[PDB]
Ligand binder design. Structure first.
Ligand SMILES: NC(=O)C1=CN([C@@H]2O[C@H](COP(=O)(O)OP(=O)(O)OC[C@H]3O[C@@H](n4cnc5c(N)ncnc54)[C@H](O)[C@@H]3O)[C@@H](O)[C@H]2O)C=CC1
Length: 244
């Protein structure tokens, strides 16, 4: 289904990104594991096997993004799918207590990093689309982008940026045969969950359980597949009903 495709996934050394890298590879994709956590990237890539390449990079820095893209193209010759999944947050707290240094770092990863990775790959994607090869950008946002609860204000707003840029890129890039979509996950069983924080979260999800990486990975695999070739500009909630 993703056979022949090459997916570059940021933040794939852990959590949701790790689940997507594994699910995509099981679907026949080559996967470029881009993460600032070199040990996690290498573990995931080694667990997947020869279809995975680990790339250590801080996607908030332009030089690292240039190097990660060059590495992906050297190894696999093309990139078909970009998954912007890397992200950081802040501990829940009153908004006015997040100081500018922490605010700036969160924007650097969740906003600038998406901008850098997307901007660097758009020329390649346009080349591919001109050859009749559709490309997909998938951005991982959050139910908090449009359905926030108190105490995660600046994190949630970066995910609102992501949902917005998904729409804006989608309408601009559709004639180039590039689709741009987003996923809005609810609280998931990843290492980052203790930062945004379990019975209280579970009971707030109408379907009655937390999201697991495998759940989100299936929606990502569908949206990045040719079976979704007319789906673009959407932000799909994968949340057990939390956003209703
Ligand atoms: N876990 C949850 O409850 C929810 C998470 N999200 C978003 O899902 C996405 C994946 O997060 P999780 O898997 O849960 O957390 P995670 O911490 O397990 O995985 C995030 C990975 O991105 C990497 N990362 C952070 N900054 C980076 C940078 N400059 N450059 C390269 N890699 C960087 C991290 O090293 C990490 O391996 C994130 O964007 C997160 O904001 C959205 C709402 C719910």
């Amino acid at each position: 289904s993703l056979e022949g495709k090459v997916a570059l996934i940021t933040g794939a050394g852990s959590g949701f990104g790790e689940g997507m890298a594994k699910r995509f590879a099981k679907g026949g994709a080559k996967v470029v594991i881009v993460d600032r956590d070199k040990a996690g990237a290498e573990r995931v890539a080694g667990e997947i096997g020869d279809a995975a390449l680990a790339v250590a990079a801080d996607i908030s820095k332009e030089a690292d993004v240039d190097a990660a893209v060059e590495a992906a193209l050297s190894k696999f010759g093309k990139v078909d799918i970009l998954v912007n999944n890397a992200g950081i947050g802040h501990k829940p707290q009153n908004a006015e207590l997040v100081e500018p240094e922490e605010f700036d770092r969160i924007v650097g990863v969740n906003v600038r990093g998406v901008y850098l990775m997307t901007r660097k790959l758009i020329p390649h994607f346009k080349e591919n689309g001109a050859k009749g090869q559709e490309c997909v950008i998938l951005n991982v946002a959050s139910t908090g982008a449009g359905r926030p609860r108190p105490n995660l204000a600046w994190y949630n707003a970066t995910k609102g940026w992501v949902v917005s840029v998904t729409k804006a890129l989608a309408i601009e890039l559709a004639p180039a045969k590039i689709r741009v979509v987003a996923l809005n996950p609810v609280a998931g069983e990843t290492p980052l969950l203790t930062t945004f924080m379990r019975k209280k979260f579970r009971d707030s999800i109408p379907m009655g359980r937390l999201l697991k990486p495998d759940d989100l990975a299936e929606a990502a695999a569908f949206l990045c597949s040719p079976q979704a070739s007319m789906i673009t500009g959407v932000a799909l909630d994968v949340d057990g009903g939390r956003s209703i």
